[PDB]
Amino acid sequence: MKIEEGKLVIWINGDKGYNGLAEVGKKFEKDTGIKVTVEHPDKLEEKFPQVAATGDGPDIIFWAHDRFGGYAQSGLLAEITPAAAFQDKLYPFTWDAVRYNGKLIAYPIAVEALSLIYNKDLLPNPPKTWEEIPALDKELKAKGKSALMFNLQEPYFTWPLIAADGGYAFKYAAGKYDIKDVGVDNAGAKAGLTFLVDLIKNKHMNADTDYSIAEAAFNKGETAMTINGPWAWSNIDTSAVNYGVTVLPTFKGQPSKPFVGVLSAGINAASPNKELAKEFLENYLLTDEGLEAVNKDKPLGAVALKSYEEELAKDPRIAATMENAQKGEIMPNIPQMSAFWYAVRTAVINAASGRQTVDAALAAAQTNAARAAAMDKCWFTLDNAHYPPPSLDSMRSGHPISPASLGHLIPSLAHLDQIINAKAIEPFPATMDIHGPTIIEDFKWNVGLGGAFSRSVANYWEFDRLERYIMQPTRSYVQKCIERDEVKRWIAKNKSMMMMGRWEVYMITGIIVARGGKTWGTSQTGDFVWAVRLAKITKSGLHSDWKMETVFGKTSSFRGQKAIF
Ligand SMILES: OC[C@H]1O[C@H](O[C@H]2[C@H](O)[C@@H](O)[C@@H](O)O[C@@H]2CO)[C@H](O)[C@@H](O)[C@@H]1O
């Protein structure tokens, strides 16, 4: 489904209640006429940043909150603006889970955590410790069953055992997550992963077990236990298994520490239906009846809406979910969490199969997570210049004064003195929002932009803040830009035959303003555009429609500047 004004496209993982969500979308369509298309594509948490950059993703994306901070860093999420009356309807804990740089960047839906699900008929008294599971599996293999089966392919399900005796992702200190203090290869994490590998080495579990294998085995009554969240309860209801939901087993006397996720709905920063999305999420989904329809499809856990949460609070399965959640930790939403998960996923798979030892798997995972890096760089400093920032009022004016303002078309970064569309910027359509000012760095005079800024600005200490203004050009907006007389005449100045039917232009699609308040004076202490983001618009020939992409890494020219961040 293609995103378009007048419709809503929603992405939600295939294990959630997407049919119940679609029913809420049908009611929204009945009242308003706005069609709501719900989809559950594979690997949506990885597809979203790619398709959202191209402006061809969903209007609303559902996922656990850990991914949304990385989306917010890239500016892919619209800041949600709920009234105080609506914020009072949701628990403050859930609002805190969807906060990035102080701003709310998603609507919290429900708190979810892993629990131990056991067959009350096969196992009337579940084991309280991980250590007693081998002996239990031996007795259950004698009766034609197995003790425990759960998804060994995703680190989300193995992590509670890994973190039980001291494993952790990123240490929280000084009010921040220290991305250089990873606890993936410490003694606690080694003991946890070793116990898991020993369970496989002793044939108590198979390292190839995934989500489908474990769900089918438990719902058929072939294994006495599994580990899963509330979304899986309804499938067990359909089966003939009298099941229970209780605490995860302890390890070395310590409780298993599941990573607590908060299912959240973010709004695409490039969506042209932000008001429709806000209306659907606030007035239809985040209601007793919208959440009821979703929860009846696939249970959500402890929902964020206080009214429906109080209604479901008597459910003992929710109480077990809350107990495991209290014994665990909330997931960080820092952008490095994606690298953390990939590293731990590789480590568990390589240790469970025997490809690597536990020490070698976790050591490589520690390095890859702390070396998250790979932050594809698209920001170029404006060297040998001090361009004052454009006022937010003038950015939509069609003729901003500063050369470094959004919408300006330049031959190259080295030719910011040659604005092609100077004072003739094609009007931004009402769908193209300018996202900003976004505080990306609070200066208080390694990690952060302080090093790049201090190395680039002689009077760096005289500025306290960096503010980002981002826009995303649409195909139709660029088509109107390249059809204006200023661009047509600039293209027509070509004299070469090798460039006939060929062109390239750069559009300023992002600015980062330094806010304050060799010998330099008062002019250098004033605000200025420190960095810019560019989109390269190119037509390669007659039979090729023009393409556009954000300039990453470096620019292609003589003295091609390198992207600092
Ligand atoms: O396994 C790594 C994975 O863990 C979490 O994803 C969970 C998700 O939160 C649950 O709702 C459920 O769908 O299981 C998933 C694991 O398969 C993280 O949210 C995710 O970012 C991470 O990749």
Side-chain angles (χ1 to χ4, degrees), residues 13 15-16 63-64 66-67 112 154-157 231 331 341 345:
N13 200 59
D15 56 354
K16 312 298 174 180
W63 198 262
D66 59 313
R67 295 264 167 181
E112 55 195 44
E154 287 289 341
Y156 178 78
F157 301 86
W231 53 84
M331 295 194 220
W341 285 123
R345 164 159 43 251

Side-chain angles (χ1 to χ4, degrees), residues 243-319:
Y243 68 99
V245 185
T246 187
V247 271
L248 297 163
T250 66
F251 178 64
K252 299 177 70 173
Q254 300 287 344
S256 290
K257 299 180 60 180
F259 251 151
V260 179
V262 175
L263 180 64
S264 315
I267 301 181
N268 192 322
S271 167
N273 310 289
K274 296 184 187 63
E275 295 301 317
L276 302 177
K278 170 176 181 174
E279 172 83 29
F280 172 81
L281 291 171
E282 293 191 9
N283 296 341
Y284 287 79
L285 176 63
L286 287 175
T287 64
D288 281 359
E289 329 91 43
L291 295 179
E292 182 188 23
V294 175
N295 195 91
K296 286 180 173 299
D297 188 3
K298 299 294 177 57
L300 290 157
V303 307
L305 187 73
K306 297 174 180 175
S307 64
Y308 197 53
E309 196 277 333
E310 289 177 334
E311 181 180 334
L312 303 188
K314 296 182 291 293
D315 190 359
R317 308 169 301 172
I318 305 295

Side-chain angles (χ1 to χ4, degrees), residues 200-243:
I200 295 167
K201 183 168 55 63
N202 295 317
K203 302 295 182 58
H204 302 304
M205 298 186 313
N206 178 21
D208 287 314
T209 304
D210 56 22
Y211 191 92
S212 311
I213 296 290
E215 178 181 42
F218 184 85
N219 292 1
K220 286 176 181 180
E222 303 176 9
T223 185
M225 291 176 300
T226 190
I227 300 182
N228 225 319
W231 53 84
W233 294 340
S234 70
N235 271 9
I236 319 176
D237 285 327
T238 306
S239 70
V241 179
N242 292 107
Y243 68 99

Side-chain angles (χ1 to χ4, degrees), residues 201-477:
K201 183 168 55 63
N202 295 317
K203 302 295 182 58
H204 302 304
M205 298 186 313
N206 178 21
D208 287 314
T209 304
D210 56 22
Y211 191 92
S212 311
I213 296 290
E215 178 181 42
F218 184 85
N219 292 1
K220 286 176 181 180
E222 303 176 9
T223 185
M225 291 176 300
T226 190
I227 300 182
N228 225 319
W231 53 84
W233 294 340
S234 70
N235 271 9
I236 319 176
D237 285 327
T238 306
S239 70
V241 179
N242 292 107
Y243 68 99
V245 185
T246 187
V247 271
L248 297 163
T250 66
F251 178 64
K252 299 177 70 173
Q254 300 287 344
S256 290
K257 299 180 60 180
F259 251 151
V260 179
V262 175
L263 180 64
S264 315
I267 301 181
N268 192 322
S271 167
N273 310 289
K274 296 184 187 63
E275 295 301 317
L276 302 177
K278 170 176 181 174
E279 172 83 29
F280 172 81
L281 291 171
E282 293 191 9
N283 296 341
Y284 287 79
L285 176 63
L286 287 175
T287 64
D288 281 359
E289 329 91 43
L291 295 179
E292 182 188 23
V294 175
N295 195 91
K296 286 180 173 299
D297 188 3
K298 299 294 177 57
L300 290 157
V303 307
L305 187 73
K306 297 174 180 175
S307 64
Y308 197 53
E309 196 277 333
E310 289 177 334
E311 181 180 334
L312 303 188
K314 296 182 291 293
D315 190 359
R317 308 169 301 172
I318 305 295
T321 298
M322 270 285 293
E323 190 178 2
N324 289 303
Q326 284 283 340
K327 294 169 178 295
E329 291 225 39
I330 190 69
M331 295 194 220
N333 57 78
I334 64 181
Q336 297 78 0
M337 283 292 303
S338 184
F340 161 80
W341 285 123
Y342 192 20
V344 181
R345 164 159 43 251
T346 300
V348 176
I349 288 185
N350 282 343
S353 63
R355 302 294 168 265
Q356 295 186 331
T357 60
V358 168
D359 291 351
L362 289 184
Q366 174 87 7
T367 299
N368 293 314
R371 192 209 62 210
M375 246 302 307
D376 216 5
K377 303 173 182 175
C378 58
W379 289 99
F380 303 91
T381 57
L382 298 185
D383 309 332
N384 307 12
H386 195 99
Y387 294 114
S391 62
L392 186 61
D393 177 71
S394 70
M395 310 193 78
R396 288 238 182 200
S397 72
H399 60 307
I401 304 177
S402 176
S405 40
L406 305 178
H408 270 170
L409 293 169
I410 56 182
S412 71
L413 186 60
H415 299 115
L416 202 61
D417 57 351
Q418 301 177 309
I419 309 288
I420 306 173
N421 58 343
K423 300 183 179 183
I425 306 185
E426 174 71 15
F428 301 146
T431 65
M432 269 185 50
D433 296 318
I434 294 183
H435 308 297
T438 305
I439 310 305
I440 64 177
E441 189 76 53
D442 266 310
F443 286 139
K444 294 173 292 296
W445 277 294
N446 43 66
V447 52
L449 300 183
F453 184 81
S454 59
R455 285 182 268 107
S456 167
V457 184
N459 57 328
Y460 56 92
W461 60 89
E462 292 181 337
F463 302 91
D464 58 295
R465 211 166 59 258
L466 292 185
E467 305 197 344
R468 182 187 67 188
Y469 300 86
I470 286 303
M471 77 170 188
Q472 182 156 342
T474 62
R475 261 266 175 183
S476 55
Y477 174 73

